[PDB]
Amino acid sequence: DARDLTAFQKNILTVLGEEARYGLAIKRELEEYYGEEVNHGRLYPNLDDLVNKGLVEKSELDKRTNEYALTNEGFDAVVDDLEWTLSKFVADADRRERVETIVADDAAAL
Amino acid sequence: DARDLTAFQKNILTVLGEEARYGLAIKRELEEYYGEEVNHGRLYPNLDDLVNKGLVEKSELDKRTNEYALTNEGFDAVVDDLEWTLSKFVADADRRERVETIVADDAAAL
Ligand SMILES: [Cl-]
Ligand SMILES: [Cl-]
Ligand SMILES: [Cl-]
Ligand SMILES: [Cl-]
Ligand SMILES: [Cl-]
Ligand SMILES: [Cl-]
Ligand SMILES: [Cl-]
Ligand SMILES: [Cl-]
Ligand SMILES: [Cl-]
Ligand SMILES: [Cl-]
Ligand SMILES: [Cl-]
Ligand SMILES: [Cl-]
Ligand SMILES: [Cl-]
Ligand SMILES: [Cl-]
Ligand SMILES: [Cl-]
Ligand SMILES: [Cl-]
Ligand SMILES: [Cl-]
Ligand SMILES: [Cl-]
Ligand SMILES: [Cl-]
Numbered sequence: 001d002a003r004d005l006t007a008f009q010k011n012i013l014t015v016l017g018e019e020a021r022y023g024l025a026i027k028r029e030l031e032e033y034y035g036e037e038v039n040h041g042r043l044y045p046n047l048d049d050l051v052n053k054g055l056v057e058k059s060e061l062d063k064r065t066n067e068y069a070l071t072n073e074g075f076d077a078v079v080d081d082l083e084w085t086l087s088k089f090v091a092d093a094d095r096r097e098r099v100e101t102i103v104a105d106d107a108a109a110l
Numbered sequence: 111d112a113r114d115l116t117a118f119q120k121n122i123l124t125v126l127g128e129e130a131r132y133g134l135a136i137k138r139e140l141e142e143y144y145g146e147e148v149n150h151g152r153l154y155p156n157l158d159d160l161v162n163k164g165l166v167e168k169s170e171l172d173k174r175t176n177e178y179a180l181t182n183e184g185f186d187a188v189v190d191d192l193e194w195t196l197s198k199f200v201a202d203a204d205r206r207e208r209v210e211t212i213v214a215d216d217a218a219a220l
């Protein structure tokens with residue numbers, strides 16, 4: 001599994017689970033999550049790690065810009081952790097109601 | 111913030127989101143997740159960290175039950191990360207349906 005990834009690496013995969021993105025756009029999504037700046041020197045070595053692990057695929061677009069996307073193995077890692085999180089969180093009917101409301105509101109906002 | 115926690119620390123919170131637990135029980139749940147041993151010396155220093163951060167407490171349910179449990183702030187942290195994860199995962203109708211099915215199957219197992 002990918003269950004030994006860092007939180008930062010897992011968050012990259014979560015970002016790419018929404019859609020494929022350029023490196024700079026991943027950085028912005030992570031900054032919005034953390035509420036803090038994310039340095040290029042942290043992001044890109046971690047992207048290279050995820051590509052080497054087969055969880056992310058890279059597509060070069062010019063010379064300063066790459067597009068990154070989940071592989072199926074990377075998507076499986078996102079789903080695996082979501083399934084585990086939900087298995088623990090959905091502990092009674094009120095928890096089930098909370099989750100279902102979140103999902104339906106996210107879908108309605110699309 | 112709770113968004114700066116390590117993956118290991120976030121996984122403790124997830125375990126306690128299911129129910130309050132004795133330390134040895136947290137260890138078991140984490141070992142089932144990771145598929146590798148989790149040493150005393152990794153788990154308990156991090157439990158102490160989460161207590162000092164106000165996310166976990168030692169609770170005394172009755173006179174003979176003293177377990178680890180989420181504080182209100184710890185529960186907020188678990189919900190906050192689930193909300194962010196779902197906001198990125200629920201990216202179209204098929205993703206919506208997938209999460210609905212995960213939740214329904216979890217609920218049925220209760
Ligand atoms: Cl981490
Ligand atoms: Cl991290
Ligand atoms: Cl994480
Ligand atoms: Cl983008
Ligand atoms: Cl870029
Ligand atoms: Cl960009
Ligand atoms: Cl998750
Ligand atoms: Cl699971
Ligand atoms: Cl309930
Ligand atoms: Cl709830
Ligand atoms: Cl309901
Ligand atoms: Cl609700
Ligand atoms: Cl227990
Ligand atoms: Cl114990
Ligand atoms: Cl123990
Ligand atoms: Cl026990
Ligand atoms: Cl498992
Ligand atoms: Cl305490
Ligand atoms: Cl709680």
Ligand SMILES: [Cl-]
Nearest residue numbers: 085191192195
């Ligand atoms: Cl999550």
Ligand SMILES: [Cl-]
Nearest residue numbers: 193194195197
């Ligand atoms: Cl959010």
Ligand SMILES: [Cl-]
Nearest residue numbers: 204205206208
């Ligand atoms: Cl899907």
Ligand SMILES: [Cl-]
Nearest residue numbers: 214215217218
């Ligand atoms: Cl059902």
Ligand SMILES: [Cl-]
Nearest residue numbers: 215217218219
């Ligand atoms: Cl059933």
Ligand SMILES: [Cl-]
Nearest residue numbers: 215217218219
């Ligand atoms: Cl049934």
